[PDB]
Structure formats: structure tokens, C-alpha cells
Amino acid sequence: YQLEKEPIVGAETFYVDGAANRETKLGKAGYVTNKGRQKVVPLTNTTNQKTELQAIYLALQDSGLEVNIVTDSQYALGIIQAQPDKSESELVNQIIEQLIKKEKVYLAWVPAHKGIGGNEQVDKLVSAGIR
Numbered sequence: 001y002q003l004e005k006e007p008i009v010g011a012e013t014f015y016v017d018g019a020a021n022r023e024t025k026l027g028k029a030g031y032v033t034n035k036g037r038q039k040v041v042p043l044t045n046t047t048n049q050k051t052e053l054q055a056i057y058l059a060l061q062d063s064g065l066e067v068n069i070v071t072d073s074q075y076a077l078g079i080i081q082a083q084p085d086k087s088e089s090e091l092v093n094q095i096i097e098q099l100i101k102k103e104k105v106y107l108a109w110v111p112a113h114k115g116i117g118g119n120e121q122v123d124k125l126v127s128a129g130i131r
């Protein structure tokens with residue numbers, strides 16, 4: 001697979017986010033799209049970074065052949081921008097299989113809690129009752 005250098009104009013944009021509880025290890029991954037599409041999935045035995053990759057996997061599963069994904073996860077961004085062929089993580093390998101499936105993917109990064117509206121909406125959905 002290959003990543004777009006710039007946004008696909010007109011393609012549904014998924015804002016993704018995760019939240020995990022350290023003590024309990026319970027979490028939520030989800031997304032919110034510019035088209036009013038939303039998804040929250042509860043999670044068990046997980047970490048912050050696993051919920052962030054899980055949010056991305058969901059975005060890819062539910063999207064369309066061209067897609068824009070906007071994450072606040074430096075960790076997942078590195079994984080995906082490094083374009084591995086295979087990883088030890090089953091989750092990463094599934095993400096990679098999705099990315100080979102797409103015609104165009106554009107992934108961008110934005111900082112957490114800085115007012116970027118789609119990011120902020122999904123943060124409140126995933127972090128409800130968790131943080």
C-alpha cells in the first residue's frame with residue numbers, strides 16, 4: 001500500500017480516537033465522520049495505543065475505497081507511515097490488509113485537545129465513562 005500526500009476532496013473523513021483505563025484496562029475505540037456517521041465499540045484488556053489502532057481499523061472497515069482518516073495518535077501514525085509488510089501484532093496486520101484493499105487512503109495527525117472539531121467530538125464519545 002501507499003498513502004496520499006494530501007486529503008481526498010469529497011471523500012468521507014473519519015475522525016478516530018481511543019480511551020483506555022489503566023487500572024481496569026477497559027476501553028472504547030470509535031470514530032465520527034463529516035457525514036454524521038458515528039461508531040463506539042467497547043473494549044476489554046487493552047491500552048490507549050491499542051484503542052487508537054482499533055479506532056483506525058474500524059474507520060477502514062466502515063469506510064469506502066477512498067478515505068481520509070484523522071488521528072491524534074503519534075504511535076499509530078508512525079506504524080502506518082512506516083509501511084510495514086508484516087507486524088507481530090495481529091491488529092496491525094489486519095490494518096495493513098485493509099490498507100492494501102483501499103484505492104486511496106489519506107491519514108493525517110492532529111494534536112489531542114486542541115479544538116480540532118471532529119477530533120474533539122470523537123474524544124468525548126470514547127472517553128465517556130472511561131477516563
Ligand SMILES: CC(C)c1ccc(O)c(=O)c(O)c1
Nearest residue numbers: 017018072073112113123127
Ligand atoms: C491529555 C491526555 C490524558 C490524552 C492523551 C492522549 C490521547 O491520545 C488522547 O486521546 C487523550 O484524550 C488524552
Ligand SMILES: [Mn+2]
Nearest residue numbers: 017018072073
Ligand atoms: Mn487519542
Ligand SMILES: [Mn+2]
Nearest residue numbers: 017018112123
Ligand atoms: Mn482523546
